[PDB]
């Protein structure tokens, strides 16, 4: 039924001695892997606790060992058997008693579901509980389960370790697999939650393995095909049992995989040679996490020394002896004493945990005893009355070294901290085909990257980033999809990227560079005489300089002879100065200064044109008045109209400021690499047209009076010469207006107007001086 | 200890017989108001259940009555006593037994905490529970408490009824008050949650009343001052006990309140005379919600007929007898038999609930027994093995009539539906000063609005809306603040409200209306001859029409006499037609047609103006050529230049399309109510200037020719007449430009330019008409 050990203070114990069988009977056959090994461990702990004078020197400690049969309902009935001893008041019945048996704590509930039940029924009666094999993450809410403590870390720490290895090694795609039950699902659920909470990682696959059958071998193909749908995902994490992973590896081998994606194992994978067989090539490179294992020396010596006639407190030892050696009292066994010789048994990894659990209880009880009373040699009555939340507080704040090297402690929640060591499988080049240690995880991940290569490869050989990092000079961040990985699209070539996250538009009037770092147009467009067509006008201007160097030559000496006296001296000075004025104007407009000095050039063509025609205007009137019927008088009237032209540009300056702007923008989207720039001063089509039209207005009033001049027998050569010039001048002016209309639609017209205007002035001036100088050469050759 | 009743099937019972006292002893004195009345009710129910052949005919029903002492820890020790009888297996001890007592259900846990605790310990063992006095809303989660049922509705239904009355009667501002414990806080929390879930209501105040002392009378002044801060909130809901509300009403009375805000009571307020004393004026109009009460006739007869020698099963009856009459075995009592005479006792309102609870349990067992086995007369063995979720399912699906008229049922959650009746206090017009019924609440609110009139006024007199309706013709919705109640602001005056929630800008070119419903401008601006200054030009045009009827009068007969022959005949016809053409132009431009007929008008001033000067042009040339040294030739040269004017409008037709637009926009923000509009065809400043400027060229040439013509000894009066007219027109043409520029900045110039143009055309013609008149009067006089 239950083992009873006498003592003034006792603690209970739940262990799965038997195993559940058919639906009818709660439990049938016995189990040796976890049934008797753990009981003997607890009994051994109590024996040496009572022997040790360091802990509880003057007070003894007892216990009540008991079994659960691995059933929730059976656990509840038994847990009530602890507490009824103190809760029952009395019984009004007689047959024709026993000590109260006050318990102080309970140690057990190895499973998960039985722990949840026992925690729920003992939370009400305020009795502390310490578990040793309950790894489910559900028993982690302090509010939900007040009185509960664990010496074994849950799966949440294991999931944290995996995501730390994935994060540190560098990966973005991970595929999760899980088996049936409450282990695989809770593992991946924690893994997903931590990844979402920490950020930077994502889940791309999530397949579930049912347990309706094991001899199908089709669902395995379904999942492996599902995992192969995206070749980029090369890392998978597994939470299944050993049989499942054995099947998956077999499927991968028979499928002749070409990607050979990496695995990440859980505690079920661990370090065991049984699962791997003929799959050593495909299982290579699998990172597995396993809890640290320690072997004690005291328990083994104790357990190997017990026999039937030595100890009788244990009620299930005889049945275990019968089942272990397979002999019943048709084979009989008497005094074999070969438990450690006939059977090659090895202690489990959880024996160290139950020994630590008993210790933590004994230490907290020991501190509570010392703090409550110190003036009493034995057991003070204050201890019996005090119990409940006080002992739980002492259990949380405990710190010591157990049977293993590592210490034991409890954090805020109440579970022991996680300590794992990472393993890896290497066979293609390693001296030993077995697993090799590569790192540990206690509080921060400590992993030797250079220690793992698994042959013919660097430690960072595999890549899984969901997108190749795009840095060819263009980048942009798109919100579409999961925030895990980013997609980059080529933005327009007319602007550069800002903060490596967006393509903002750069300020105008300048092209972007090639590497998309700055937006500036170094190249510019400038007018040149040699390269563009401006050479021909330049040659024409040079030719005009030669012409005026010959007209004015025969003027210095020929100033008093009675040959030039026929022409008026005052009129001769006007034409001499007018011819030189236009020669300087064409040279000025040809040149393109950057500074705002064109103001002195615009008057050369605006005001310099009037004085050229002024002498011709008064000359026509002078030769016509003598036909219809004071040289200083003709000088005055011409001087007056010069002032009109001079005042014309002055009032223009008062109308609007003479601001000079050299900046220009092409604003062409056809060729973003092209950058056309033009600089001009006071460039207005109306300004140049109206200023030039002033001469045309007075030329009309002069030509009309010249119709009657033709045929006068005064100077036949001179009269015929003037009439020839008039028709030529009207020709160039009549052709000038059509030019700018219907042609400014393009972008290269900024330099063509200047050239055509240049040759127009030279052509109009050459014809004027040609007829004027025609009679002058007669006195030279003749 | 506990009352035990024999039976093959039994159910347990928890009742608070005693009350907790000092810290040492768990419970001390007994309570009569809830201790013994409820037990005797349950015992009576069991007796008549066993007597009634309708339910469980061949099978009896027993029970185990037991007390809880109103302690959480004590309730646990008792619950274990129920469950141990069936869960315990055996006990290995001897002294030198009792019936198994299999329970099937439990009825009890009156309080709130003990119900939560008992529900927690029995949920694990899967034993159904029915409570009768647990009204807390926490016991309403089916997931948290599987095996739990209630015959008394929780407080959530009460909070729903209040918010339904506030919503139905129409209010928006409410203030919440609550007391200490787990009743007031949970009540208002539910009220707040339902208000937010249903919507349309808000909480403006939330004050909390501690319970550290009872003789301070200061905290009440603080809260009433807090509640008086906003005069708008005239409705408060209270969840406190009777002592608290008695103090608040006293505080309101001594504060001489002027707002007299309304109250809404809870179940604690109910319908009692204790809560009202000298405050009848200020408590008037308090809507209170109370559960329906019914009185049974069987229990009273049973309880009044029991005596010490009659019944012995009850173990606490003797102590109750001693405490009820206050006599101990220094006053002794023997055989009084005046329980119903010496004490004026009345049964509680919860007795009907325990009787319903016992019934629901009996019916569910009756159905389960009938459904499970029907071929056996007695108790079939299947019933003992069957238990757990099945009986719970049969308890949920039950429906019958209990001791009261109303039936009992359980909804999806497991708590009985709420059924209340609404009360109100009235003491001015009603003959009866007491409370009067005004409505009921079972599934939908049924309230008689016309039946309640508080404050000696109309029913719906008080309102609390946070704001007036604010519908003066325009409104805007503001998101600031709580969505419950809103603030309205006046938007700009130039647009109307859209969907009664926003002020969008209506299309321009018109004005909005006054009620903010439409955006259209009916009024328009049209030129009139009578009202504006256009009368004077109109009268001038009429004067010219009369004047021209005199020049042509002496022209038909005087065509062959040798007096008029001095003037050119062809010239006379030209000037005769020119005068009549201008007379028609001034009339056409005066009129403003809306139709597309202005094209025939513009030619009157475009082409009809040149023909007026055409005769004048050739007249001056004709008299000048004879001075420098063929009537048909003069006719041809004038006829040609008319064609140029005729072609002038032709090229204008092909240059731009004659699009006519009558719409106009003032775009003035100074007067939003003003709407100015002008309709004109082809309104361009340059068009009228250039068309009129063409005639200036020819007139200028005539002016210079006439100036040189002066002094010729050919005509005396005619030469003097033509000299003066050439000097008069230049003045008005020179002044036309100054008034044209720098004047159009306003908005009323659309019609002032026409008037001045009309007069200008008339006066420019009268000077010519007067010049022709002088020769006419001369020949008449001569």
Numbering used by the authors:
A (entry chain A), B (entry chain B): 41 to 136, 144 to 376, 387 to 686, 698 to 850
Quote what the paper states about this structure:
We look first at the metabotropic glutamate receptor mGluR7, a class C GPCR important for synaptic transmission and neuronal development in the central nervous system. mGluR7 forms a functional dimer with extracellular domains (ECDs) responsible for ligand binding and dimerization (the ECDs in the dimer are disulfide bridged), transmembrane domains (TMDs) that mediate coupling to G-proteins, and short intracellular domains (ICDs) that are largely unstructured. Dimers of mGluR7 have been shown to form immobile clusters at presynaptic sites in neurons and the ECDs have been implicated in this behavior. Thus, the ECD of mGluR7 has been shown to be important for cluster formation in cells. But molecular details of mGluR7 assembly are not known.
To address the mechanisms of assembly, we purified native membrane vesicles (NMVs) derived from cells expressing excess mGluR7. NMVs were generated using N-ethylmaleimide (NEM)/Ca2+ and those containing mGluR7 were enriched using affinity chromatography. mGluR7 clearly forms bulk phase clusters in the NMVs at these high concentrations. Selected proteins within the clusters permit calculation of a cryo-EM density map of an mGluR7 dimer. Using the single molecule translations and angles from image analysis and map refinement to position dimers in the raw images, neighboring pairs of mGluR dimers can be seen to contact each other mainly through the large extracellular ligand binding domains. The contact sites appear multiple, instead of being dominated by a particular pair of surfaces of the ligand binding domains. Micrographs with side views of the mGluR7 bulk phase clusters show strong protein density on the intracellular side of the NMV that does not appear in the final cryo-EM reconstruction of an mGluR7 dimer. While mGluR7 dimers contain only a small number of amino acids on the intracellular side, it is possible that other proteins from the cytoplasm—purified along with the NMVs—could mediate cluster formation. The mGluR7 dimer has twofold symmetry, and the contacts are made through ordered structures on the protein. However, in contrast to HCN1, there appear to be many competing contact surfaces in mGluR7 rather than a dominant favorable surface. Consequently, clusters of mGluR7 are not arrayed with the kind of regularity observed for HCN1.
